[PDB]
């Protein structure tokens, strides 16, 4: 996307009001060195059925599958990243994808294959 | 009995439908940020324009 | 209930389907006063589809 | 649970003391002040007797700070006096709350003693009364907070 | 840029470039809302006769300015009204000075 | 800016100062440079020469 404006008000306005077909791109994450060597790609937009490793925060070092992606709030849900409630129900802790790394992809649609073919 | 023009009757019906409070699920969904709207009106305090 | 199917049909069938759908809508709105709260929405949009495509045909 | 106010009392020992509060009450803070000045430093049961008597209008409460146009009463030591019934009732409710809290903490009611009793002014509820010559003047309610601390004499 | 890096290491101005990098701060005040954050320090100034790539090569070094002789001003030579800036000259630039004298 | 309100002054003999005031419900002072929401006495101007 085209972003050439040195005014923070305009940058943050774009970010807060960006249309949906760009939030997936804004929600990208990097690959592990193995996948990087294999496919020739440094980062990809994230998807639900992906295997994921946490690199920053309290749950540093945990691995899990992605189960939910919210484009409005710019967040994702990971299995195993949870806290308990006053009563005792478990609930997910919402994470940013810039704080996480991909270790196994979900390759069942042809369009992701095309994204890789494109940026490699 | 009491004689009304029809368009006037319809405008009055609209003004009556307008006069109720914000529902409860809107308050739940907004986290107590929307509680009122500016068209509450009591028949004996603020008059319509007929 | 999609244009794929709708455009395979003739006009009389389309009008008949519109008719039955409108009666369904009236009955469902009647019961709604006293599950699946999207029946009304989907019925409305099906009616819209049918009218759009029938007009495409009768115009060409 | 879910309390949003603190106390003016310092050095609270959870082992020998219990607390109680009343918040946002539609009563007179002046009369609250006058009344609490009397039960300060007393035993809980003696204070409950005092309040019963006040309510039944057999014991008057002296007025030493808020006494404009107030008549005297029969008995030694009385200039201005009064009978605040609403305030008595509310204070009685709070005192029973405190007695319960001590009983459940594990103290002994026979030796409970009031060591802190203070009234505070709460938030005002604005109102208006129509006057003559096209005016409208305030007609407001002043609310009251009351705090109480009980200790066990050993 | 890497060749410029090596040349500056051999000449002895890489340490002033490092000072420029290190002495760069986030401002105090409301200029941060209006952009204008990151008050940046000044490094060396390269005066050249003709540009044939050195502008691109040296641009991205923090504090480094590149200018030709025909387009010199006093803000390149005395930032903040304080004169005595570290300057790298060229032979052609000095000959053009011999010609124009200013 | 500051010169959008319509005002009327009360004058001598109201136990009040001679300030220009709005003529509906609140009746707040307006348009003067010591009033809240009024015009500024000596604002910056683009005519000014900086060169």
């Amino acid at each position: 996307m085209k972003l050439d404006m040195k005014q923070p008000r305009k940058q943050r306005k774009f970010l807060y009001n960006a249309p949906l077909h760009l939030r997936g791109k804004i929600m990208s994450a990097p690959l592990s060195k193995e996948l990087r060597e294999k496919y020739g790609v440094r980062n990809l937009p994230i998807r639900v059925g992906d295997k994921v490793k946490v690199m920053r925060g309290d749950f540093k070092g945990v691995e899990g599958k992605v189960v939910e992606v919210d484009l409005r709030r710019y967040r994702i849900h990971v299995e195993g990243v949870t806290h308990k409630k006053t009563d005792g129900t478990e609930v997910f802790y919402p994470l940013h994808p810039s704080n996480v790394m991909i270790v196994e992809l979900n390759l069942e649609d042809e369009k992701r294959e095309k994204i890789i073919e494109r940026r490699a | 009995a009491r004689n009304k023009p029809f368009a006037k009757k319809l405008r009055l019906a609209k003004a009556a439908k307008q006069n109720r409070r914000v529902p409860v699920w809107v308050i739940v969904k907004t986290n107590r940020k929307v509680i009122t709207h500016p068209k509450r009106r009591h028949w004996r305090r603020t008059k319509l324009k007929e | 209930m999609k244009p794929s199917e709708i455009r395979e049909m003739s006009i009389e069938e389309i009008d008949k389907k519109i008719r039955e759908l409108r009666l369904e809508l009236a009955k469902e709105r009647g019961v709604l006063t006293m599950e699946n709260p999207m029946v009304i929405r989907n019925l409305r949009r099906d009616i819209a589809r049918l009218l759009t495509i029938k007009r495409e045909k009768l115009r060409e | 649970s879910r309390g949003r106010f603190s106390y003016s009392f310092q050095n609270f020992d959870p082992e020998r003391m219990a607390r109680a509060s009343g918040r946002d009450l539609r009563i007179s803070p002046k009369h609250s002040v006058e009344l609490l000045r009397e039960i300060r430093g007393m035993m809980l049961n003696d204070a409950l007797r005092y309040l019963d008597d006040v309510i039944a209008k057999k014991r008057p409460v002296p007025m030493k700070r808020f006494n404009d146009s107030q008549g005297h009463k029969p008995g030694k030591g009385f200039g201005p006096g009064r009978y605040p019934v609403k305030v008595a009732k509310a204070v009685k409710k709070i005192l029973l709350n405190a007695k319960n809290n001590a009983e459940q903490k594990g103290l002994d009611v026979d030796r409970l003693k009031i060591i802190h009793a203070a009234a505070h002014r709460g938030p005002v509820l604005r109102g208006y009364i129509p006057r003559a010559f096209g005016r409208a003047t305030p007609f407001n309610e002043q609310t009251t907070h009351i705090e109480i601390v009980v200790e066990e004499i050993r | 840029t890497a060749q410029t890096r090596e040349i500056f290491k051999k000449l002895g101005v890489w340490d002033d470039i490092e000072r420029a990098k290190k002495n760069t701060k986030i401002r105090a005040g409301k200029g941060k809302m209006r952009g204008r954050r990151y008050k940046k320090a000044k490094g060396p100034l390269i005066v050249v006769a003709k540009n044939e790539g050195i502008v691109q090569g040296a641009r991205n070094h923090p504090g480094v300015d590149v200018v030709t002789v025909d387009n010199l001003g006093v803000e390149y030579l005395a930032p903040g009204t304080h004169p005595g800036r570290l300057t790298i000259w060229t032979k052609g630039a000095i000959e053009r000075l011999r010609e124009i004298y200013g | 800016a500051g010169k959008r309100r319509v005002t009327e002054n009360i004058g001598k003999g109201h136990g009040m100062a001679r300030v220009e005031r709005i003529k509906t419900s609140p009746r707040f002072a307006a348009f003067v440079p010591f009033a809240v929401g009024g015009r500024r006495t000596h604002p910056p101007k683009v005519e000014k020469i900086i060169w």
Partner: protein, 62 residues
């Protein structure tokens, strides 16, 4: 006198009702024209330069 008591004789027919073109209650019912838009008196809109009403309605500077 002239104050509170004459205010009781405001139960007659109103001087203005709603206008079909403008929307507001300024249509003079006995003369047959609107005092805000000119309906019944002119095809064109009432629009004076000394007025602030239309500028306010469009959020314009004076």
């Amino acid at each position: 006198g002239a104050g509170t008591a004459p205010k009781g004789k405001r139960n007659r027919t109103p001087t203005h009702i709603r206008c079909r073109r403008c929307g507001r209650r300024a249509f003079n019912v006995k003369k047959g024209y609107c005092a805000a838009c000119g309906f019944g008196r002119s095809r064109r809109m009432r629009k004076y330069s000394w007025s602030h009403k239309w500028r306010k309605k469009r959020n314009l500077s004076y």
